[model samples]
Target: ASTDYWQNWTDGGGIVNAVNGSGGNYSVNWSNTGEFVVGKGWTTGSPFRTINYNAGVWAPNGNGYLTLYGWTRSPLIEYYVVDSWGTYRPTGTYKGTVKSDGGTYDIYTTTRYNAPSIDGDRTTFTQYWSVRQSKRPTGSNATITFTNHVNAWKSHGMNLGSNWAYQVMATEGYQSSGSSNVTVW
Candidate 1:
């Protein structure tokens, strides 16, 4: 099984393992006591109108999230569609809520000043988030109507750039411990 894309970034202690299978499928296993993100997805972002995924996560003690993640160039934006989390939830300026895929997601916007971006430089950028109100149970298959969120974001003036970047189904942890195995298509 060849991988399309994969990334594993970590710091401090504990082991982090990640794998990317063919056709936009990936997995990660870790007990990292540092910030880390392991993910895999398409090389392009815009064409993904819908995503069907099965996300399995086990993070009894940690602060992390399972999400659909991506970036764009022109606007230099980072976006996340968070479906589940452990312990802590990400917070920012509330932008209201959206109904999609039979679930309600609370929207938020965060500005990261001089942060690392896809351009490999320290620059300011906006982060768009749509966090699910209820955690999706592990091992359950679900569908995400990505266009719905995109339109919802636009309604709030959070427009995405046409220069799409890599879009991935990712598991991110911050000074915590956890594992995630996800399949997307």
Candidate 2:
């Protein structure tokens, strides 16, 4: 017989005790406000997950940037992308500028097929901008602000037979004071 399924599922709760240069976590509580959970996982489904926030930590090498990392089960695809910007906050507002090597990308709000629900269960939520891609502006240097919410989501069990997982990743960046820069891979 298969092992207890519950044992296989990871817990979705973690402490938000990390701090960046800003000296605080990047996440905020928005349930009481207009902000809500984007969706239940991605195309597959999410069994379990966790969210953490670290403030002001430079990306990789004092470049004033950070990377977003996520994971899921096998069969399902894992996403690893870097943004000149960092993670999203549940509440409050986040504003910054970013530049990318790619050109001709539109900034629009598109919904991911699968997203996790607020109860930490499998469910679908309406349209939410892809914080990673959406907030990015045209040309090399673009500035954006996330007010009251961060644009991000995750899910598990896409094609898996009731037992699969997945993950999402993002990165952040900052320039020295008023200096504008492009995000390199």
Candidate 3:
């Protein structure tokens, strides 16, 4: 069985729905008013994953705007760049860490938005890059540190009403090879 609900606000589409049954894919519809939240079942001790309603879909909707979020992990070398909001100009690098069974790996990265927009017309984008570490120190905590120059646009312009979004992609072997102990938070 399945059920649907609706809300009308100024954010985007305010429509939402829920599905309750043994198992099956479900669809949801919304108005261009309020935001939507979709949550799936949880693991016995795992947290539930949710999808924001206001984000863009694969297909275009003539009315409002849409945004997409995704990530990947690999073992080979990778590259990325960070860009400005309006001009979509290259800004600086994005830094972070990758933890695995072996130890912690520090990553210096960047992003390139095909076309990014603040007026809700996201057209350009950015890319990211990083260095790899083959060996890890024993009895040491695994962590990655990234440092980059920050401009006014990326430091202040990219704020999305208290909600900021970013994408991350990594190569393989960065994690501990023998231990099944890898996590992201």
Best by TM-score: 1
Error of 1 at 66 (Å): 0.5
**Residue 117 in candidate 2 has what lDDT?**
32
Per-residue lDDT over 109-138 for candidate 1, one digit per residue giving the tens place of the 0 to 100 score: 999987567786477889999999988776
TM-score of 3: 0.22
Which regions in candidate 1 have their CA more than 4 angstroms from the true location?
1-3, 11-14
What Cα-based lDDT does every candidate model obtain?
Answer: 0.79, 0.25, 0.24
Descending-lDDT candidate ranking: 1, 2, 3
Q: TM-scores for all candidates? A: 0.88, 0.24, 0.22
Residue 178, candidate 1: Cα error in Å is: 1.1
| Each prediction's number of clashing residue pairs | 0, 34, 49
What's the distance in Å from true for residue 28, model 2?
Answer: 14
lDDT computed for candidate 2? 0.25
Better candidate by lDDT, 1 or 3: 1
Collision pairs in model 1:
none
Candidate 1, poorest ten consecutive residues by summed lDDT: 1-10
Measured with C-alpha atoms, the lDDT of residue 128 in candidate 3 is 35
